Design a protein around this ligand. Structure first.
Ligand SMILES: *[C@@H]1O[C@H](CO)[C@@H](O[C@@H]2O[C@H](CO)[C@@H](O[C@@H]3O[C@H](CO)[C@@H](O)[C@H](O[C@H]4O[C@H](CO)[C@@H](O)[C@H](O)[C@@H]4O)[C@@H]3O)[C@H](O)[C@H]2NC(C)=O)[C@H](O[C@@H]2O[C@@H](C)[C@@H](O)[C@@H](O)[C@@H]2O)[C@H]1NC(C)=O
Ligand SMILES: *[C@@H]1O[C@H](CO)[C@@H](O[C@@H]2O[C@H](CO)[C@@H](O[C@@H]3O[C@H](CO)[C@@H](O)[C@H](O)[C@@H]3O)[C@H](O)[C@H]2NC(C)=O)[C@H](O[C@@H]2O[C@@H](C)[C@@H](O)[C@@H](O)[C@@H]2O)[C@H]1NC(C)=O
Ligand SMILES: *[C@@H]1O[C@H](CO)[C@@H](O)[C@H](O)[C@H]1NC(C)=O
Ligand SMILES: *[C@@H]1O[C@H](CO)[C@@H](O)[C@H](O)[C@H]1NC(C)=O
Lengths: 413, 413
């Protein structure tokens, strides 16, 4: 452990953490330096696993994950106060929140060139994970899981493949929340999603079927029919550009119906907090670096997307059969809808183990409830979180914790 | 106005109502006597319309409507306290909550034979509405709307047809919330609903397609394929009989995962309240009558369903073109899912007026939001309430009030 990176007193806490936590920089490729925030397991660090968490974007910060999803403490609406999180993932794991790629959040490079791409980012994360274990050698033995969300449906499998090549790293599994595994399945499934969740109506549905579909197999992905395109554009406008919350359809869109924030998202609370000069100091951030933003428009706009499907990477990770894989999805998200990933998993053709069923969670007074549905295959499970959006741990923390706990512990869901 | 039916001091109110309200009995057919609860418009009774509200079941009470959906006051969880409702429908209307048919709630008949059927109930309500105006002659001029929910998708159109025949009654329109307009469309649409909301998965979806469907149409209603039946039964089990809240898919099921209550519904609050002997007295209920239940198992079990589709009744009501009709649906309800009714309306073939679009509601701080989608035809509109279940005014009162206000006032939604 690099002592100088230790986080001493973090502004906004009434009482200090019972666990150690560190914040500093990992070396990536070239002259890139990625900001990390490591929170030790609240219960026996030396024998709790090591979890990497990556938020997607591309261009968005993994400190959102910490501060608004499943960190030990969550920033409150005043931008100043932090409250502990009873459902935090670091209750049972050492969680490494990594701001990546170069330029996102407090991460930078010496040359400040932040245009990048999937292969470069993968390599960058891999090298940063390497640099991590040089700094934290006592955690080289721990079980190592790679977890992410959103565009990290690309970051994580591509990374995992590189990790798979290094047997010094003790990779045990990976989990992806509302991930982007395949553009084609995501795009085709979203359109069905839109109709059957009441956004489209029959004239538009008919047109779509007519122009984009022959004999009950649709192309809403890369269809060249010009009448299909005109309708896909309409769908795109309804879903993404007309007042709905794309991250969570049943939630209001932050700030009425109309720097890069994610859409329908208020990022004030977290930004206010992390730009506090005393917070930057507590987190060993060098002063000269620009303000913190949840996402970087530059990164996102300059980002070159190369992989069109994670089918290879997942089969390549499944072939070895050392690795336990989970894809979970909020079933009211339209950014990466649950069905797209259910199709993606089903089309991996693995040996079915447990048939598709409910899975439960115990609530105070409410008793047991259905938290979602789960379909298990050999080493790979698909699972939904009923009534949760793009950011599962925010919408349904308890269900998210349960899922995660049962994942870490090789247990049935 | 029958003075003796006036409600004087209603237990559970801190301060007495500014509006008059009456509770007593209307004569139906034979020896049947239906309990009513009439709440005068809070704003100018003499020029506010007359609204009939019927809950469905069959066998369930319209006092649920009053006390838990859109009455001037709603019973609170202690079963004792009533709190005023700022979104109450009697803000702008004279709402007549009618317990029907004979045997439901405080309604009875001298002979106590409560087996009945759609044609008899229609006639019974019609005659009770007649008896109403004998008792309340000063309301014969007022605009008269017929509104209901649930099985009242049958009660209301069938009633309306009888009302249509009597020009002494000033019928101006009717509205149905998550109504049962057609068993076939309800049933076929529910199955798509189930798959695309993540409850079914692909093995079961494939089977269903294979056995219940040939190329561009499914029969999930009355299909005779024995392999189709086995799968429809599985769907029926998942949707209705396995822990989900059929009234609202994203809500917990009241009282864990396994007198007739509705399923997943806690009826304690209202029952506790209405069985209070002082409440019965205040509401001029004769003592000898049995306890109040939100639904009557006898009624429901002995009930004979005759109409299989309201297509005739609606066209018959639309032909005249004196009548303004609304069908609205919560889009997360599985009892009477929104699509079934959207299909039902679309298949009425009326002259399209306004194309399908969003409709908005203003919230405190949140600004304008999308409350749902609306598709207008001449004299008949279909409209959804996004994120609302089977009981719209409970899940989304403000949206429900707005909708209703805009309906009463012949205004665009
Ligand atoms: C939905 O429910 C309504 C109301 O109950 C039914 O209408 C009623 O049908 C019943 C019998 O089904 C009729 O009962 C009759 O009452 C009259 C009184 O004047 C008598 O003429 C008659 O008594 C003779 O017949 C009895 C048996 O048939 C004998 O045992 C007696 O001794 C005596 O000889 C009998 O008691 C009601 O008159 C009738 N009411 C109304 C308002 O119509 C619906 O029944 C349908 O419509 C009816 C006209 C008739 O065609 C029924 O067969 C139909 O089913 C009922 N609908 C359905 C689909 O069940
Ligand atoms: C994705 O991003 C990576 C990293 O930026 C790109 O690879 C890099 O491309 C550079 C410029 O094309 C390469 O620079 C060369 O370096 C040598 C010195 O060793 C110079 O003498 C030479 O003049 C170039 O400047 C760089 O080597 C390369 N880096 C790595 C780690 O491979 C990548 O570009 C694509 O692949 C590489 C291998 C090249 O062949 C490019 O032509 C090609 O576009 C980016 N991927 C895409 C699809 O754009
Ligand atoms: C965003 O959050 C801040 C801090 O929580 C709050 O004061 C503000 O009202 C929010 N802004 C909008 C546009 O909703
Ligand atoms: C039903 O409501 C009553 C009072 O409103 C309450 O005492 C009881 O615990 C409730 N049951 C459930 C399962 O919520």
């Amino acid at each position: 452990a690099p002592d100088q990176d230790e986080i001493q007193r973090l502004p906004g806490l009434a009482k200090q953490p019972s666990f150690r936590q560190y914040s500093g920089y990992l070396k990536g490729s070239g002259s890139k330096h990625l900001h990390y925030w490591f929170v030790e397991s609240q219960k026996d660090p030396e024998n709790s696993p090591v979890v990497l968490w990556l938020n997607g974007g591309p261009g968005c910060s993994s400190l959102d994950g910490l501060l608004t999803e499943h960190g030990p403490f969550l920033v409150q609406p005043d931008g100043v106060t932090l409250e502990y999180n009873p459902y935090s993932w670091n209750l049972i794991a050492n969680v490494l929140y990594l701001e990546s790629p170069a330029g996102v959040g407090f991460s930078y490079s010496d040359d400040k060139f932040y245009a990048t791409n999937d292969t470069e980012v993968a390599q960058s994360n891999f090298e940063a994970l390497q640099d991590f274990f040089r700094l934290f050698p006592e955690y080289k033995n721990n079980k190592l899981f790679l977890t992410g969300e959103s565009y990290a449906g690309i970051y994580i499998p591509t990374l995992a493949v590189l990790v798979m090549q290094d047997p010094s790293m003790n990779l045990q599994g990976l989990a992806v929340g509302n991930g982007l595994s395949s553009y084609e399945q995501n795009d085709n499934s979203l359109v069905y999603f839109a109709y059957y969740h009441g956004l489209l109506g029959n004239r538009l549905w008919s047109s779509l079927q007519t122009h984009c579909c022959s004999q009950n197999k649709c192309n809403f992905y890369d269809n060249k029919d010009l009448e299909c395109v005109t309708n896909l554009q309409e769908v795109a406008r309804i879903v993404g550009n007309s007042g709905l919350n794309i991250y969570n359809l049943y939630a209001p869109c932050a700030g009425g119906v109309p720097r890069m924030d994610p859409p329908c998202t208020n990022t004030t609370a977290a930004s206010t907090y992390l730009n506090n000069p005393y917070v930057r100091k507590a987190l060993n951030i060098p002063e000269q670096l620009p303000q913190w933003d949840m996402c970087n428009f530059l990164v996102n706009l300059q980002y070159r997307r190369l992989y069109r499907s994670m089918n290879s990477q997942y089969l390549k990770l499944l072939s070895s059969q050392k690795y336990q894989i989970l894809l979970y999805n909020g079933d009211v998200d339209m950014a990466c809808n649950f069905m797209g990933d259910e199709w993606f998993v089903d089309s991996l053709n693995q040996k079915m183990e447990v048939q598709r069923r409910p899975w439960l969670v115990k609530y105070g007074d409410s008793g047991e409830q259905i938290a979602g549905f789960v379909k298990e295959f050999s080493h790979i499970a698909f699972l939904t979180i009923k009534g949760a959006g793009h950011m599962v741990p925010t919408d349904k923390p308890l269900a998210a914790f349960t899922m995660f706990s049962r994942f870490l512990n090789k247990q049935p869901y």
